[PDB]
Amino acid sequence: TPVLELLEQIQQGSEEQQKEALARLQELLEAGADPNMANSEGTTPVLLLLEIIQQGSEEQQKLALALLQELLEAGADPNMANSEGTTPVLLLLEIIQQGSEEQQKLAAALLKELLDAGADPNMANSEGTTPVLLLLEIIQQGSREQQALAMSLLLLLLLAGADPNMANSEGTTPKELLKEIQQQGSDEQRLLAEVLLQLLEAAGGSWGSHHH
Amino acid sequence: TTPVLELLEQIQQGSEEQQKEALARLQELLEAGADPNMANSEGTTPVLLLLEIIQQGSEEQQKLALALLQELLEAGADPNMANSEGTTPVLLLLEIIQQGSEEQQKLAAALLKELLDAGADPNMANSEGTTPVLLLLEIIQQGSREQQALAMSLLLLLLLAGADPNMANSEGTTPKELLKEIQQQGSDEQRLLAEVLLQLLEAA
């Protein structure tokens, strides 16, 4: 598909070629290009773009926010997962989980774009890992920068409608993971865990009973 | 005064034997058609008097009054009816947390959820314009480590209920303005809570 190869020519192109990437995508989309056409393995233009961010230079990174808004404005489905079952939001959080501090700041901004585009905050991957459960992993095993960022994004997801009780395939609930963060976490990790544990304990039996 | 108010008055200024059967007595009084909103001469509603009992009462009186609040709210007590000074039940609860024991703090957190489920306005301020969010940030700024964590989760519980994080008080002090102050001179844990709330606000 024309869109997918262009994205491949951005990752596999020069830095000066990157200058023409936003314009080329705009002229390709205006020409009637499908912003959702996946390739043989099911990678969508959004997923490949996030994949470029994950493996690209800082120059390729700053380019991708405009390329994502262009794809989202063109009508890309923000919930279309790849063949493995990885949603753009779950791939974004993996970029935060394993990325540099620069990638962390970017994927945080891209997540807001995806939520605005209409991404499902409860859509899990093939293993049942929800966006909330992955953010709790980022808090438990991430840096002090990742702790605060994953903390605010989790509240952002809860406000967006994420349910803090959905478990994964192994039956691991977010509350079970919060107890782990409290038991063996740092002074700051335990504080974040105690906050989230108190929030859950007061609206766990009925999440949304006061959302009026 | 009002039979509901008279019963509540007998609990705080009475012995412990009166307290055990009080929940049953209120259940039969409300079922008999007693108005759970009738205030006295000073404007104290049955809910506001019950919160006064929690703040000044023994631990026995405290856990009894949490069940008594559920009864009054189910009977149709207004969770937004403030006293003559203009202090709403949620704002009085937070003041109880701000100055109360760890036991009173744990109790008042459950009453806030009961009030919010009843339909309490999360943005209703007092006469001074202090909003529930702004007061919770004060509890975070100058409270204990236990009060820090609890006021934090109550702040998120209020945001989930629809609290606006941009409402300022009468002096024009915004919640973001207070969060920066917590970050500049707060502890390592207070600064983390402030940085979290600052990132959340800037992103939505």
Numbering used by the authors:
A (entry chain H): 3 to 214
B (entry chain A): 2 to 205
Provide text from the study.
However, because of the intrinsic flexibility and irregularity of loop regions, organizing multiple structured loops at protein functional sites has been very difficult to achieve by de novo protein design. Here we describe a solution to this problem that designs tandem repeat proteins with structured loops (9–14 residues) buttressed by extensive hydrogen bonding interactions. Experimental characterization shows that the designs are monodisperse, highly soluble, folded and thermally stable. Crystal structures are in close agreement with the design models, with the loops structured and buttressed as designed.
The in silico validated designs span a diverse range of shapes with different repeat protein curvatures and loop geometries and adopt multiple loop buttressing strategies using loop–helix hydrogen bond networks and loop–loop bidentate hydrogen bonds. From a fundamental design perspective, the crystal structures presented here show that computational protein design has advanced to the point that proteins with multiple ordered long loops can now be designed. Key to this success was the design of dense networks of hydrogen bonding and nonpolar interactions within and between the loops and between the loops and the underlying secondary structural elements.
